[model samples]
Target: RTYPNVSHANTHYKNTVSSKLLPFTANYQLQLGELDNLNRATFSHIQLQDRHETKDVRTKIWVMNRGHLVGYQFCGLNDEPRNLVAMTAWLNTGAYSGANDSNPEGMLYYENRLDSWLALHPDFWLDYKVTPIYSGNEVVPRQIELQYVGIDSSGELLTIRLNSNKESIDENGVTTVILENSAPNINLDYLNGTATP
Candidate 1:
């Protein structure tokens, strides 16, 4: 069965908040070693040199999963020296275009994997952190990791910030995220499961 490939991971959406005026750009670039690469539908953060320039950035990434689906939510920092200490979340459904079994013969539907959650509370823009959650009844350690990178608000070339270890979990895999440089951080890992009501 097809499982979630960390290398083929992509960003689905991103949102940011700041208290200063500065040009910021947010982008999700999926670099699959040999599979292929897929960037976000569009660039969320571009350029804005102003104080408290908060922008809600959202993007989506997809992979060829015959048995599973992978998704992500990115919280970008636009301000040069700002921290995201707010609560943000992202969700995905198993119903898109070719997600239904109705047209099993020659039909195409959209089926979202599950839902994902991310929570951030940084003390300063220089502080980096990560939190992982569990999901599903599947018993298979999902090898996951966080890749920290930096890019200008003008969508210039990206710079690698830091790379985390491969976190593995079974029967409700755990999600992990990371931050770098104190300023401009992102939660790159989340478990796609049912939300607690």
Candidate 2:
């Protein structure tokens, strides 16, 4: 209940255009990191049952060149997704964009990777305390939360948590994996002039 609110943090980017007629698209990125929370809870990375109840946590980022506003969103999927934890689903303005784009349906381009953690209900919501765990020349904490500035009914407005499992620490202070996603892809093109030709 006391999670960090970085949704208001300035990403320090410029907004260049504004209009209501231009087409809009939503892109996504995923990431995994080590954090203090990973060591202090009773979480399991592996599914123990053949049809165990699970939740898929999907995060999305949107850039509207017409309006020059970037957006963040999250979803808890009860049905299996296309990308699992390794793929990030991207929804563009049209079918040629490789997105699902079904009418009244969420994107399906990233559902195949969500086999292990499909959601059972929509009550799951992601908490906002994020620490980026880097394992390279130096291991450090990327202690930053997410920020959002818009909302809509098409799953474009809110951060979500698919909280079906809780991480549990063991008797020997060993950390278990409660939930894991792929490394985040942080590149999004929000400028019309900068978009692919």
Candidate 3:
């Protein structure tokens, strides 16, 4: 069995009996164009993986601010790398809201126009809440929440919430249907953030 390593040249492999496999790494150049004084951004990591069963390739890019994991971008490996670069540049421009003393959640608040756009094309956004760990006051993530608006596998339009502390998927999260022509008023409470049933 052969293991693949990072290189500049593009390589291809097949998944058959008595075949070879190699890992390929692609390099990307990130240029920090320009930014405001109070704003900051950094690329933490980029990972590539192959989904064995499906034979699909995926790429994940983690973006950070102030030493905290603020957000990430995930897409197919074949997708445009330039788009990822463009988003990286945009994040540095401070067009998106950032964390402050009062609002330590960081990147959780979206501007009105951005919110409207996300509302129209709901996607996954993971948020973490951290706290000092021990008597030494080492900060660590206390909780993680995955907030998203999407159609679940069951074909229900929902506002999904997943928390790290939850047990089983059945009891792990809350799913609220915000809009449905079949039952428009069913989730008014959850939709308004009042209560959940």
Candidate 4:
């Protein structure tokens, strides 16, 4: 196998606190090689600050969850801004009333799908990539793109044929999910994490 060893690329987190996007939560990308072979560990690092205002917004104001662009379960990241984006309660954990956090939606949908595929095919490794698509100068992404391709030990694609009904599974056997970052009945200001009910 010519594939490189499994490794994670920590997002250089585009801090919203910088000379900044919304000067808050900006868009970025996370790409992992041989994502299935990660050295799993419990996370306990990366002191988080409220620069993005995602936390307080959830607590006192509205429901703005710190959502990950790349899932921590798949990557070695435990707590880091580089791995997250300003996501909605509903989009992240299906918390419609900011009460229930079950039934994953948005990013979790495909994250679960690819994670399951990796488990089902241990002999295979996948190249996982994610990027949030920001519209105009908005700091938070309005949409995101998650792309995955499977490779066997020999460096060949798992298969060139489609495996599911998803329109995102292209002819080259790559799966891509484009999801929105908004919640129902909520109008949010991506720049500052403010909400308009």
* All candidates: TM-score: 0.18, 0.17, 0.18, 0.59
Per-residue CA lDDT of candidate 1, range 101-159, in tens?
Answer: 22211111111111000111011111111211122431111221222222233323222
Best by TM-score: 4
lDDT of each: 0.20, 0.22, 0.22, 0.48
Higher-lDDT candidate of 3 and 4: 4
Q: For candidate 3, write residues 1-197 as lDDT tens digits.
A: 11122111111211111111111122221222122232222222221111111223443352222222212222222332221211211122322334331221222222222233333333312111111111122121122222222222222222323221221222222221111111112221211212112
Q: How well is each residue in 1-197 modelled by candidate 2, as lDDT tens digits?
A: 12221121122222112121112222222222222332211111121111332333553343222110011122232222211211112222213334442311112211211221223212211112122222332211111112112212232222222121322323322112222111133332322212222
Q: What TM value does model 3 have?
A: 0.18
Q: Which regions of candidate 3 deviate over 4 angstroms?
A: 1-73, 76-79, 87-148, 161-197
The residue-level lDDT of candidate 2 at 10 comes to: 20
In terms of lDDT, the best-performing candidate is 4
Candidate 3 Cα deviation (angstroms), residue 96: 15
Candidate 4 residue lDDT tens string, 41-152: 1111111111211222122126456666666655545455556666776666555554342243455555555555555555555455666666655656677676655554
Candidate 3 worst ten-residue window by lDDT: 14-23
- Poorest 10 consecutive residues by lDDT, candidate 2: 41-50
Off by over 4 Å in 4: 1-63, 97-105, 159-166
lDDT of 1 at 15: 18
